[PDB]
């Protein structure tokens, strides 16, 4: 379209991707979290490590890509880079192999009142602790621990969408069964650092069929 | 248009005072820059002793003072802490010299904390497949010494300082391997006299 | 779609003064409100924004030690205020409610108010 | 920061010309806006994004510019046309507008 053309041409042409996003300063952005797994991959009880597919699916708001749909073509929607534009940094601490950050090739959904929904998919390998006590008759718990890595509690609240993670497009795996996978936010307090940081806990209860 | 009070100081910081991050911030000529840092051990996760590699995740906290990044509180109606990515600022090269792969640096590049002071605090994530070597003779009932040597490969002696802050390596977010067992963590400063 | 201003006022200088806008026939929020004064000159000028959602307001640089900028939520009215008016101040006050997307235009204005030092 | 300048400053033009305003910037932008003015009214958003009409605008007029350089167009001058027109852009801080070209008979 050519009016959604010039709506890309408006949208970046002086746009700091460094800074963080709200209007006034002494205002946290509060990130709506969800995490949804394709499947489970393997669990490694010699290593004690566990390898997931997850699609971290992240909304926030943004007061500087917001614009109005009857100037503009009628166009509600737009897609960008995830390059281009502020985006977090949601971090999980019980990490075991190789780099932390998660890739940038997908893509952004900006909505016409600044609400940005972003999708990234990842391979995670936690770092679960298991017990053998029982075998192969056994119950296993394994968490993983989603936070911002830098950022307080004063300037990125976390809230989670539902109260689970979500196994609609669960590919079976055919040797654990998941009985259950809640997901608590807590407000915890380090001992390097003075100040308050959120995160958000997820904990798959697997069981081994024998 | 529209902008931040945080928009307006990276404004001012970076593009206006047209900001170097390739020189080191030396007031005048043979400064030494007192950097200091401190570990926090996050887990023990493999101490492997076929390859002889162990792999853990530390925290190190590395921190001194840049005086080009100073400004007035009152000015932008009021921030004392402000946070930028890390390849926009000066920063030593702290790494490993002993890993069994070839990845000395973090992989990962958070943004780091900078205040009002100029006083710049880094803290990168990392996970370091460390390599030590094992004392097999009273096995299974055996203490391991294992060592992670931190220096920078851009500067030396003459120009940056190296100031280990508190004895031991913090305990704080430890998880218990379950399998091994850590009695103490002390650490050290190397200087060899007779050679700078 | 309407935008209710106060009448003409007379104010002697050193005193302040107070003027109001309501908007009706529209969501109140989600436009953002300017005040725009115009002279004899036909050289018209800008004072502030506010969002009425939040209170964020922007002032000019010029202007940013004489105006205040108030808005009240329940009844869907802004206020301003001018401080120290000077002879150079007797103008026409137009307050104008526009969408804060790209544009960044002024969709609709008022009726003007005029103030005489 | 950027001041913005009109040329002419009083003009006039029969029913049936082509009319052509300058508004002049100091540094350069890309997008500006253009609103009319009557005698004794208030005025009316009438041009934005530097060409596109308004809602409740007639198609004879035609913006155009670039860098530092703009204009407005008139094909088909009517009567019911004399106004004031002002250019007014927000690329840089703070709003500015333009002096107002006068259009009469």
């Known amino acids: 379209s050519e009016a959604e053309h010039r709506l890309f041409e408006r949208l970046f042409e002086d746009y700091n991707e460094i800074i963080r996003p709200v209007a006034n300063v002494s205002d946290p952005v509060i990130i709506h979290f969800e995490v949804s797994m394709s499947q489970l991959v393997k669990v490694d009880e010699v290593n004690q490590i566990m390898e997931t597919n997850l699609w971290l699916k992240q909304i926030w708001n943004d007061y500087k890509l917001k614009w109005n749909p009857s100037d503009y073509g009628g166009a509600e929607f737009m897609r960008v880079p995830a390059q281009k534009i502020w985006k977090p940094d949601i971090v999980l601490y019980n990490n075991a192999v190789g780099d932390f950050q998660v890739d940038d090739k997908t893509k952004a959904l900006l909505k016409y009142t600044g609400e940005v929904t972003w999708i990234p998919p990842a391979i995670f390998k936690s770092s679960c602790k298991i017990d053998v006590t029982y075998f192969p008759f056994d119950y296993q718990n394994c968490t993983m621990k989603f936070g911002s890595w830098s950022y307080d509690k004063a300037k990125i609240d976390l809230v989670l969408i539902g109260s689970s993670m979500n196994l609609k497009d669960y590919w079976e795996s055919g040797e654990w069964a998941i009985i259950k996978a809640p997901g608590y936010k807590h407000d915890i307090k380090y001992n390097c650092c003075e100040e308050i940081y959120p995160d958000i806990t997820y904990s798959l209860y697997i069981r081994r069929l024998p | 248009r529209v902008a931040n009070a945080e928009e307006k100081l990276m404004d001012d910081l970076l593009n206006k005072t047209r900001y170097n991050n390739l020189i080191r911030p030396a007031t005048s000529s043979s400064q030494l820059i007192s950097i200091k840092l401190q570990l926090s051990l996050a887990q023990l996760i493999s101490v492997n002793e076929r390859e002889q590699i162990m792999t853990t995740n530390v925290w190190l906290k590395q921190e001194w003072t840049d005086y080009r990044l100073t400004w007035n509180s009152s000015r932008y109606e009021g921030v004392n802490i402000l946070r930028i990515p890390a390849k926009r600022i000066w920063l030593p090269d702290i790494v490993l010299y002993n890993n069994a792969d070839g990845t000395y640096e973090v992989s990962v590049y958070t943004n780091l904390i900078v205040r009002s002071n100029g006083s710049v605090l880094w803290l990168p994530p990392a996970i370091y497949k460390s390599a030590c070597k094992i004392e097999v003779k009273y096995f299974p009932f055996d203490q391991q010494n294992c060592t992670l040597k931190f220096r920078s490969w851009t500067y030396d002696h003459t120009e940056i300082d190296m100031v280990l802050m508190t004895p031991t390596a913090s305990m704080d977010d430890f998880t218990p391997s379950g399998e091994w067992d850590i009695v103490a963590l002390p650490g050290r400063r190397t200087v060899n006299p007779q050679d700078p | 779609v309407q935008l209710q201003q106060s009448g003409p006022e007379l104010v002697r200088p050193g005193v302040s003064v107070k003027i109001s806008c309501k908007g009706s026939?529209?969501?109140?929020?989600?436009?953002?409100l300017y005040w725009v004064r115009q002279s004899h000159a036909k050289s018209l000028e800008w004072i502030g924004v506010?969002?009425?959602?939040?209170?964020?307001?922007n002032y000019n640089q010029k202007f940013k030690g004489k105006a205040t900028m108030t808005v009240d939520k329940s009844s869907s009215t802004a206020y301003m205020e001018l401080a120290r008016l000077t002879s150079d101040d007797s103008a026409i006050y137009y307050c104008?409610?526009?969408?804060?997307?790209?544009?960044?235009?002024?969709?609709?204005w008022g009726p003007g108010a005029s103030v005489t030092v | 920061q950027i001041v913005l300048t009109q040329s002419p400053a009083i003009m006039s033009a029969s029913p049936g010309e082509k009319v052509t305003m300058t508004c002049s910037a100091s540094?350069?932008?890309?997008?500006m806006h253009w609103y009319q003015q009557k005698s004794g009214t208030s005025p009316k958003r009438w041009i934005y994004?530097?060409?596109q009409l308004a809602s409740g605008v007639p198609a004879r007029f035609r913006g155009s510019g670039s860098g530092t350089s703009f204009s407005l167009t008139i094909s088909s001058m009517e009567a019911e046309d004399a106004a004031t027109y002002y250019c007014?852009?927000?690329?840089?801080?703070?709003?500015?507008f333009g002096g107002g070209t006068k259009l009469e008979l």
């Open positions: 104008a409610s526009g969408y804060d997307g790209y544009p960044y235009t002024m969709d609709y």
């Open positions: 026939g529209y969501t109140f929020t989600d436009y953002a």
């Open positions: 506010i969002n009425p959602y939040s209170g964020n307001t």
């Open positions: 540094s350069s932008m890309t997008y």
């Open positions: 994004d530097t060409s």
């Open positions: 007014q852009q927000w690329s840089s801080n703070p709003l500015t």
